[PDB]
């Protein structure tokens, strides 16, 4: 937990959403999210930001 | 669009993507998923998500 996150990954993230979101995307998000944790935390937060709201807890 | 063109930085990076996420533009194409706007995200990916408007079809 020394280095922030690859400035090339984040680009893949935002570039991933560009996809259709279902087929590759799934692998794209998980892909980067995997090759980049800090990113996942962000994205994941965004994804859950859709539920976390409806379902308060986490 | 981005909202950190006057700062830029790690947080700005994730803030850029996250920012774009909030304003899912895909909504224009995913006129169907437009419902949630990001319902295409909650789709699942793994083997579950929540339980609000089948973001995939049958979760």
> Are A51 and B42 an interchain contact pair (Cβ–Cβ within 8 Å)?
yes
Residues preceding chain discontinuities in chain A with C to N over 2.5 Å = none
Structural domain harbouring A35: 1-58
Task: Please name the fold of domain B1-59.
Answer: Helix Hairpins (6.10.140)
A47 close to B50: Cβ distance less than 8 angstroms: no
B11-46: buried (b, 16+ CB within 10 Å) or exposed (e) per residue?
ebbbbbbbbbbeebebbeebeebeebbbbbbbbbbe
A39 close to A10: Cβ distance less than 8 angstroms: yes
- Residue A39 sits in a domain of what CATH number? 1.10.1630.10
The rounded distance, in Å, linking the Cα atoms of A15 and A19 is: 7
Count contacts between A and B (CB, < 8 Å). 68
> Are A29 and B17 an interchain contact pair (Cβ–Cβ within 8 Å)?
no
Cα atoms found within 13 Å of the Cα of residue B26, Cβ hemisphere only:
24
The rounded distance, in Å, linking the Cα atoms of B47 and B59 is: 8
> Are B49 and A51 an interchain contact pair (Cβ–Cβ within 8 Å)?
yes
Residue with tokens 């419902």: B35
The rounded distance, in Å, linking the Cα atoms of B41 and B7 is: 28
């Amino acid at each position: 937990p020394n280095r922030s996150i690859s400035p090339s990954a984040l680009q893949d993230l935002l570039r991933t959403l560009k996809s259709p979101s279902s087929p590759q995307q799934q692998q794209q998000v998980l892909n980067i999210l995997k090759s980049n944790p800090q990113l996942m935390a962000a994205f994941i937060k965004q994804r859950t930001a859709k539920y976390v709201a409806n379902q308060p807890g986490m | 669009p981005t909202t950190v063109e006057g700062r830029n930085d790690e947080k700005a990076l994730l803030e850029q993507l996250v920012s774009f996420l909030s304003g899912k533009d895909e909504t224009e194409l995913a006129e169907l998923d437009r419902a949630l706007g990001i319902d295409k995200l909650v789709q699942g990916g793994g083997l579950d998500v929540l339980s609000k408007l089948v973001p995939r079809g049958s979760l």
